[PDB]
Structure 1
Amino acid sequence: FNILLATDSYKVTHYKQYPPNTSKVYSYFECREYEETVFYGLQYILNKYLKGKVVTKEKIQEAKEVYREHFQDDVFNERGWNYILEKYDGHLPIEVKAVPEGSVIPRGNVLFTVENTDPECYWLTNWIETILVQSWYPITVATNSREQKKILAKYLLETSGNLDGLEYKLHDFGYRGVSSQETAGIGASAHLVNFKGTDTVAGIALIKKYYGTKDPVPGYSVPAAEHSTITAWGKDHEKDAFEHIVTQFSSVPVSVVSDSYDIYNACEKIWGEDLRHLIVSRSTEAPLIIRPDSGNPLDTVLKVLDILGKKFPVSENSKGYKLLPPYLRVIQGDGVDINTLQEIVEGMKQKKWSIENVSFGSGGALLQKLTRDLLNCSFKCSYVVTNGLGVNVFKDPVADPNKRSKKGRLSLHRTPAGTFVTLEEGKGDLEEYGHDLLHTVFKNGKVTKSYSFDEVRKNAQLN
């Protein structure tokens, strides 16, 4: 597209504020003290934006002329950009050290770094700060999404004895809830790192093009109804659609919006009586998944379940929690976020309902309403070479610590007792902990190391 304008405008200017005789600026990324993040997504932005030849006689021309109308002034580093076109044929001379994608590393720890390879390109490092920082996203989607799984995991386990079907308990509805198209895709791929069910198709295009999966396919879905494929039959024909949709999909599992008009009549009257037969006559492989989109995730699940307990044969597992007949289940697809999720399963089990009769779906809570601040994703410079000798750097606002930056050449190590540790001031060169863990993944325009979305899983997974 144009890296020359994939940066925060005021940077086009930074190349003239660095102390003079500076040959190296080394920057690092992190999630400043959710206490362990899933580092996923850097490998996308790299291939799709940095790798390869990225500077051209034409882009240097587009940039200025633009960063000219913009600034009402010629400040753009047109000189130092051709250096890059003339010498490395438009390949950025920067090294990028990161952690294996999917890695679940605690907070305040180094995840990736950026330093320039050529002393004439000292200005480049931070130029790419921006584009590279938008990882706070794939990461937060993944992290926050993975935290809901633990919640799901421990409630299923305690209420059922196992994790059967865990990976299909949170369904991403995000697509219409996101801002871009390019984004719905990136975020859908940050759920699949954890679950397999997704309606955002764009999510997979990404996976198999930037990460690759050897498996059958990264995500899936089933046929369901929406509000129009039901209200289009008429006010007084909810039952006609209900029925026309579960003979069509007699076939496989099928989800049907049951809250067009009162979702207790649809449950009791229509499913528990009229149509009670086009259902018990279904298979455990093709359940009739029921879908409320009402008011109050908790209050509703509990009641709908109460309606269904009364209209169908309820059983009870070796744990004491009630279960529905294998051909009937429920999904909360509206009003579900990490905070409310916990509320539901906890209420479900005080009532004694296997966390299994119910799966969920989250919209924008899952794909939008995520911020860089949620995890303090930050990108700062920790080391610079001025006149040949290096000096550790950082910031320390008085009106606020925690903003305090790490100093010098950082290293990410594995403590003899389990976790990690980021070593500062180049102290990692004394093999006390042995073997930095961040790998080079980018060096002078080429992607020196990628991971398949299969490893990404493995890495970011619950034990």
Structure 2
Amino acid sequence: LNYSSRASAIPSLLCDFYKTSHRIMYPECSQIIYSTFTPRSNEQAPYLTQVVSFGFQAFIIKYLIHYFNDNFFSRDKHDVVTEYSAFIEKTLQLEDTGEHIAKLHELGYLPIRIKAIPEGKTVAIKVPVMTIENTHSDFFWLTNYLETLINVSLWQPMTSASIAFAYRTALIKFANETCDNQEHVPFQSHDFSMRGMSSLESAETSGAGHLTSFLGTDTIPALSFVEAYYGSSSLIGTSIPASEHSVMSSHGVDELSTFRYLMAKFPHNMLSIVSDTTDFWHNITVNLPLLKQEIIARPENARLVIRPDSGNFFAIICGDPTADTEHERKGLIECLWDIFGGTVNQKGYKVINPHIGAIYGDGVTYEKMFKILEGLQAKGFASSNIVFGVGAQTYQRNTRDTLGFALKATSITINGEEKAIFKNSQKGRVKVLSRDTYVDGLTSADDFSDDLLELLFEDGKLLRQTDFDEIRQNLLVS
């Protein structure tokens, strides 16, 4: 973490505005507020049956430790309190001395206790993934206050990780039906989403979620994000040289020459060449046969990969039986089988010559991925014959309501006595008993041994840390 970005967010005003008004609205003698973070529904995305825990450690380190230490506890105090009071004065014409902020500063740490599902473990929809409460009686308001920051930063990484897991589940099922092994699966979903994410910070946490199930990515800052907040012994992620449309068109319309030029620039690496700049099917039916000898001479670890980027997703890959030309009635995959070799595997499915490959990365979604694999299976082609560039239409096109994430207060302690709070509904303290069952009737005095929610952060300290190997291992056993 040896770089820094300049920031504007005020540590004591990093919230929905109305949170600044709640402190004096709570009953007198309020002491503790306890809240839960739960994915409440997959109605908007029934294919996500499983929530991957991911992002907590990075969020704790980036914000609850470093941001508050760098920008609040490290800072003067008179300056920090004055900034807070002046903002309340301007916006409400209330005179809030900021004494609660001064007291927080004097403490020197966040009096907060957090438990969470270990990252890489999985939970059913509606099972809580994290709980938060304050540990000092003067700071009941702090649990309230932090709600906005917690879910603005955590629902995206868990949603992307859960999406990637559901992709991986489907890829494994097609591999079990149609392939002799699943060695291709870690590379079969390749994150393309970076430019289509809404900010660099969202690209980092989303792309990190993708990497919990997959190795392939172009989102470089996601790799370095994982390296900084998790670390790893094994390779975090990988990618390959690949051309873009501006490269192809800058060489003019003779794409046969361009292919030869690009393959000569990268003789010892896999190389993706986007193939639809001028005439996609001309490249397939004319240029690939002319290039065949050169292609099959390359080392197998340096295979040429064909990238279409236009057309109907299903027709381009699987063929369109209504089409006017033979090459279009078959898809890219069958055409590559026709031009290059292949074998028939033990399951009875066609596996194209490994000197050629195909990646499809135009608006890929789970549903489109699934339909393509079904179409190839129906034609007797193994699911390993294609890679998916999985982009912003998968990872950006979500909301907090995709998995129904909500942080809700479930218990308040007033004048020494714990009370359930709810709208009419989790009530009281919770304990996760298994991946699919929890119990909520609880008080702080109850047992809590073997809780799937494990203590993570307390009073300024990250008490439990993981690396990205453990996360991936957890997700393997899942």
Give the aligned partner of residue 27 of structure 1.
35
After TM superposition, give the deviation of residue 95 of structure 1 in Å.
Answer: 0.6
After TM superposition, give the deviation of residue 161 of structure 1 in Å.
Answer: 2.4
- Cα shift readout 1:238-285 (whole Å, capped 9, x = no counterpart): 112111011111211110001112211111111122x22221212221
- What is the letter of the counterpart of residue 301 of structure 1? I
d(CA) in 2 for partners of 1:98, 1:351: 45
After TM superposition, give the deviation of residue 76 of structure 1 in Å.
Answer: 5.2
User: Is 1:65 matched up with 2:83?
Assistant: no
Give the aligned partner of residue 323 of structure 2.
none
Give the aligned partner of residue 166 of structure 1.
185
CA contact (8 A) 1:45 1:131 kept: no
- Cα shift readout 1:415-435 (whole Å, capped 9, x = no counterpart): xxxx4421112179665x952
d(CA) in 2 for partners of 1:80, 1:239: 70
- What is the letter of the counterpart of residue 299 of structure 1? A
CA contact (8 A) 1:42 1:132 kept: no
Instruction: Please list, as runs of the form range in 1=range in 2, the aligned pairs for 1:87-236 lying within 5 A after superposition.
Output: 88-89=107-108, 91-134=109-152, 135-215=154-234, 217-234=235-252, 236=253
Q: RMSD in angstroms over aligned alpha carbons?
A: 1.7
CA contact (8 A) 2:418 2:443 kept: no
d(CA) in 2 for partners of 1:328, 1:459: 34
Secondary structure (helix, strand or coil) at the match of 2:462 reads coil
User: Is 1:458 matched up with 2:473?
Assistant: yes
- Cα shift readout 1:351-401 (whole Å, capped 9, x = no counterpart): 1111111111111023311211010101001100112211111111xxxxx
Give the aligned partner of residue 243 of structure 1.
260
User: Is 1:50 matched up with 2:64?
Assistant: yes
d(CA) in 1 for partners of 2:281, 2:451: 58
After TM superposition, give the deviation of residue 460 of structure 1 in Å.
Answer: 2.1
d(CA) in 2 for partners of 1:244, 1:342: 35
d(CA) in 1 for partners of 2:63, 2:186: 31
Give the aligned partner of residue 327 of structure 2.
none
User: Is 1:18 matched up with 2:38?
Assistant: no
d(CA) in 2 for partners of 1:83, 1:119: 12
After TM superposition, give the deviation of residue 172 of structure 1 in Å.
Answer: 0.4
Higher helix share: 2
User: Is 1:316 matched up with 2:344?
Assistant: yes
Aligned length: 444
Find the partner of 2:354 among 326, 329, 336.
326
CA contact (8 A) 2:271 2:304 kept: yes
Find the partner of 2:412 among 384, 388, 406.
384
Find the partner of 2:398 among 354, 363, 370.
370
After TM superposition, give the deviation of residue 60 of structure 1 in Å.
Answer: 2.9
User: Is 1:254 matched up with 2:254?
Assistant: no
After TM superposition, give the deviation of residue 437 of structure 1 in Å.
Answer: 2.3
d(CA) in 1 for partners of 2:412, 2:306: 59
CA contact (8 A) 2:363 2:392 kept: no
CA contact (8 A) 2:81 2:102 kept: yes
- What is the letter of the counterpart of residue 272 of structure 2? S
CA contact (8 A) 2:50 2:125 kept: yes
CA contact (8 A) 1:410 1:428 kept: no
Give the aligned partner of residue 421 of structure 2.
393
Secondary structure (helix, strand or coil) at the match of 2:457 reads strand
d(CA) in 2 for partners of 1:257, 1:283: 21
Give the aligned partner of residue 36 of structure 1.
50
- What is the letter of the counterpart of residue 461 of structure 2? K
d(CA) in 2 for partners of 1:434, 1:118: 23
CA contact (8 A) 1:253 1:287 kept: yes
For structure 1, the residue ranges without an aligned partner over 5 or more in a row are 397-404
d(CA) in 1 for partners of 2:262, 2:389: 20
Aligned pair in 2 of structure 1 residues 244, 68: CA closer, same or farther (>3 Å)? farther
CA contact (8 A) 1:296 1:335 kept: no
Normalising by structure 2, we get a TM-score of 0.89
CA contact (8 A) 1:96 1:112 kept: yes
Aligned pair in 2 of structure 1 residues 46, 75: CA closer, same or farther (>3 Å)? farther
CA contact (8 A) 2:133 2:143 kept: yes
Find the partner of 2:299 among 283, 293, 299.
283
After TM superposition, give the deviation of residue 307 of structure 1 in Å.
Answer: 2.1
User: Is 1:413 matched up with 2:472?
Assistant: no
- Cα shift readout 1:170-211 (whole Å, capped 9, x = no counterpart): 000111111111221111111110100110110011111111
Secondary structure (helix, strand or coil) at the match of 2:131 reads strand
d(CA) in 2 for partners of 1:410, 1:129: 18
